[PDB]
Amino acid sequence: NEPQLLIETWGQPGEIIDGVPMLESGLKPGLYIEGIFLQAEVVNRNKRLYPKRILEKAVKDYINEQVLTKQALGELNAPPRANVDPMQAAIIIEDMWWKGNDVYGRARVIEGDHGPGDKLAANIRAGWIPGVASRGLGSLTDTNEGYRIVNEGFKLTVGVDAVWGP
Amino acid sequence: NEPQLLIETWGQPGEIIDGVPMLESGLKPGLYIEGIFLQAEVVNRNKRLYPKRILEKAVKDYINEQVLTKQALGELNAPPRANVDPMQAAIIIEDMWWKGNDVYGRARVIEGDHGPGDKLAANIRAGWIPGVASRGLGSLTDTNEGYRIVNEGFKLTVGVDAVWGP
Amino acid sequence: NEPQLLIETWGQPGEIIDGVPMLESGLKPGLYIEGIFLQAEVVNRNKRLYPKRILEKAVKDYINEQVLTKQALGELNAPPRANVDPMQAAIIIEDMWWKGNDVYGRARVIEGDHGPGDKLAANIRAGWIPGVASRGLGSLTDTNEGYRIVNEGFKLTVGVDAVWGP
Amino acid sequence: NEPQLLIETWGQPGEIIDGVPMLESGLKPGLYIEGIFLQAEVVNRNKRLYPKRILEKAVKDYINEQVLTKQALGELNAPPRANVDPMQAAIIIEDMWWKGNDVYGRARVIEGDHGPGDKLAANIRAGWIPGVASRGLGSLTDTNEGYRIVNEGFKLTVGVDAVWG
Amino acid sequence: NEPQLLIETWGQPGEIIDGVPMLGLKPGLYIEGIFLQAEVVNRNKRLYPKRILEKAVKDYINEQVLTKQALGELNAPPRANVDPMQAAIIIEDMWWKGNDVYGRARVIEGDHGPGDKLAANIRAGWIPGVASRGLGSLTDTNEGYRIVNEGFKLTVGVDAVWGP
Numbered sequence A, B, C: 001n002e003p004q005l006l007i008e009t010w011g012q013p014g015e016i017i018d019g020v021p022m023l024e025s026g027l028k029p030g031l032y033i034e035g036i037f038l039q040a041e042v043v044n045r046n047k048r049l050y051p052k053r054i055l056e057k058a059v060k061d062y063i064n065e066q067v068l069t070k071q072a073l074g075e076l077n078a079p080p081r082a083n084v085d086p087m088q089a090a091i092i093i094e095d096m097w098w099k100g101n102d103v104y105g106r107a108r109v110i111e112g113d114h115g116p117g118d119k120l121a122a123n124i125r126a127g128w129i130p131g132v133a134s135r136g137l138g139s140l141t142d143t144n145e146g147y148r149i150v151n152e153g154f155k156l157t158v159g160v161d162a163v164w165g166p
Numbered sequence D: 001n002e003p004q005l006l007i008e009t010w011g012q013p014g015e016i017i018d019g020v021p022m023l024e025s026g027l028k029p030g031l032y033i034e035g036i037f038l039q040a041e042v043v044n045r046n047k048r049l050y051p052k053r054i055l056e057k058a059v060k061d062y063i064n065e066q067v068l069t070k071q072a073l074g075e076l077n078a079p080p081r082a083n084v085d086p087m088q089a090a091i092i093i094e095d096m097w098w099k100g101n102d103v104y105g106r107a108r109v110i111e112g113d114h115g116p117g118d119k120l121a122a123n124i125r126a127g128w129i130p131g132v133a134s135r136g137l138g139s140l141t142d143t144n145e146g147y148r149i150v151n152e153g154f155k156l157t158v159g160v161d162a163v164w165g
Numbered sequence E: 001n002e003p004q005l006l007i008e009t010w011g012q013p014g015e016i017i018d019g020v021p022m023l024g025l026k027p028g029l030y031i032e033g034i035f036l037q038a039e040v041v042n043r044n045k046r047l048y049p050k051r052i053l054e055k056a057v058k059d060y061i062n063e064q065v066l067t068k069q070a071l072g073e074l075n076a077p078p079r080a081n082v083d084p085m086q087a088a089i090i091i092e093d094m095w096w097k098g099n100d101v102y103g104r105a106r107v108i109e110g111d112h113g114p115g116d117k118l119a120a121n122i123r124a125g126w127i128p129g130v131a132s133r134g135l136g137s138l139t140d141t142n143e144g145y146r147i148v149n150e151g152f153k154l155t156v157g158v159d160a161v162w163g164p
Helices: A052-067 A116-125 B052-067 B116-125 C052-067 C116-125 D052-067 D116-126 E050-065 E114-123
Strands: A004-009 A015-018 A031-039 A073-075 A089-099 A102-109 A131-138 A140-142 A148-150 A155-163 B004-011 B015-018 B031-039 B073-075 B089-099 B102-109 B131-138 B140-142 B148-150 B155-163 C004-009 C015-018 C031-039 C073-075 C089-099 C102-109 C131-138 C140-142 C148-150 C155-163 D004-009 D015-018 D031-039 D073-075 D089-099 D102-109 D131-138 D140-142 D148-150 D155-163 E004-011 E015-018 E029-037 E071-073 E087-097 E100-107 E129-136 E138-140 E146-148 E153-161
Touching: A015 A116, A031 A089, A031 A116, A031 A131, A031 A155, A052 A089, A052 A155, A089 A116, A089 A155, A102 A116, A102 A155, B004 B031, B015 B116, B031 B089, B031 B116, B031 B131, B031 B155, B052 B089, B052 B155, B089 B116, B089 B155, B102 B116, B102 B155, C015 C116, C031 C089, C031 C116, C031 C131, C031 C155, C052 C089, C052 C155, C089 C116, C089 C155, C102 C116, C102 C155, D015 D116, D031 D089, D031 D116, D031 D131, D031 D155, D052 D089, D052 D155, D089 D116, D089 D155, D102 D116, D102 D155, D116 E087, D116 E114, E004 E029, E015 E114, E029 E087, E029 E114, E029 E129, E029 E153, E050 E087, E050 E153, E087 E114, E087 E153, E100 E114, E100 E153
Parallel strands: A073 A155, B073 B155, C073 C155, D073 D155, E071 E153
Antiparallel strands: A004 A131, A015 A031, A031 A102, A073 A089, A089 A102, A131 A155, A140 A148, B004 B131, B015 B031, B031 B102, B073 B089, B089 B102, B131 B155, B140 B148, C004 C131, C015 C031, C031 C102, C073 C089, C089 C102, C131 C155, C140 C148, D004 D131, D015 D031, D031 D102, D073 D089, D089 D102, D131 D155, D140 D148, E004 E129, E015 E029, E029 E100, E071 E087, E087 E100, E129 E153, E138 E146
């Protein structure tokens, strides 16, 4: 079929790290979410499978276009749009890497904004463990086996939104 | 009948505890609401009765799926939705337990969010005693005795929202 | 006629008291609005008169049902709704008493909420003297003398909203 | 015509005064906007003229009804309504006076509200010089000279909203 | 065409400067770099001729920058003028370097609003893009881009935007 917005939930990343004083070459503490942000070659909660070669290409382009350019914002709740709204940004992805079929990453929670970043930080400090969701643009092929395969050309547009796990 | 959103009010929990420094392994104080969050085997304010077997099963699943996974958020006002919106979260349930036919629990008010958590905390520190409401999915059978009984399969989706009692 | 929402404006209470350290059973300061909150036996700005016996019963019920139970919240602006929305609460009434044909009261401004309470407090500390409005449910009888009389059964649902005085 | 909402823009007041510790009758600092709030007998940006007698009456009634009673709030942006919404208040007028054909005033910026007052104060401290607008109720007469004259009975309902000029 | 709203994105300005105490002393968070470009086909497939942009920038400096009115927002809205309740930056200066218009914008802090949102995003590491708003018309060239016609008016020099 034709290209559509593809929103996926990927579970709760296994590490939340608060208050580590990081060097800014001058120390800045931060609240970080770190762990699995996306997964290849598995049927996910939306009954979709991302082939490894396709997600490798999408992640590489997203790293080059957004992460390394310091634009890889994400929101609290995954809205039905492909772009992040910086007024609604709650996190920024600092790094992503592969470990087998899993995409790991590290995201910093935006604090001091009197908005979604502070809301996310306060939820986390009250004990919330967030889920993460990704947003992208692509198309699906049905398999007649109860799931869909993402077609070549998938584009990752937001690596992580923080979401309440279903 | 068919499955519907079931929102119930359960009154005002009997304890509000502010500022006790709790062990975080450091110390973090917190504002807590503790008391009756749900009741079985009584006709409630909505003329509904929750059989004990059905609510035991729903509470057990909610503890495993949301409380123990650190996902059991609640809001300020009970909205006509089955899901909690984390941008609107005001509390998180830390524990639930049975005492006879009553479900007790302990909920932490989310502070520092410049949102519903801080609104709830400020209302409470001004003297407000909140009521609590639960949200779930189920169906009802009529009894011809002025109340309805919740059918088997009831699912608890939000244990506590803070609400203004009528 | 049939029961309707009745909103009345009652003018500006004569006392604003900031920062008195009150005993807690240490000390908590507060910002208070104190003075006339309702009036019986006068044609008010809406050309309505509240008979003393009807307002006496409505005030007694409101004190027992809302003030003493710590539920007597009010908002900033009087909305076209019978009950207070706790997300929009700006004050809580701590006490009400009679003086002649006037209902006096003391209301605490909710502070620390980053919401309507802080907004009200900041307006006041910049010099605003708020007006107050009440909300209730009742019906009216016309008199052919240019005003209407509140009928038996009037129910007071919100004793005070802070409002901009006309 | 018939009575309508009249919103006017009057430019940028010439003085912004930050932090002067005033005797609270303790000390309270404040952020103030001071200068021309309305003008009589000039064709303004809306091609309207306010006669001096009509504006004198409206200003006196507004001083007596709102300023002296501590109700003379204004907002950030001028909304299409006659009355101020106190949830959206950004300033309060403390004093108004005449100087020739100009109405001067002093307005305090509301601070600590986590709302439009703090927004206005933050804009001002970043360097913004606000414009001001007035709101009132009245009617207009056409003159066939390219402007309209405000008719007798004009009522001033909001002395100052802070606006982008 | 007839006069329409023209919104352009111009990329990420190259310098973000936090905390320099400027003359009492007030620190500030500043965005500095390229705010507009002449004589290039931009991301919207539009080219601004230099003389037309020179006239628009001069008028904007005289009408808004020097009068302390040159506010901008976070996100570029479909409106010609800035809403001060949504202001996130103020332009303090603009200057030319070749075909590029440079500027200095101060981030509005303490507002518990878009200004604090922008500053907090930046302190978390965001490098914003910038967009300009103005009023003008376009001529098609049949070569895959449009040229801005004479009379273009610059109404908002900089909004902070998420770069595509």
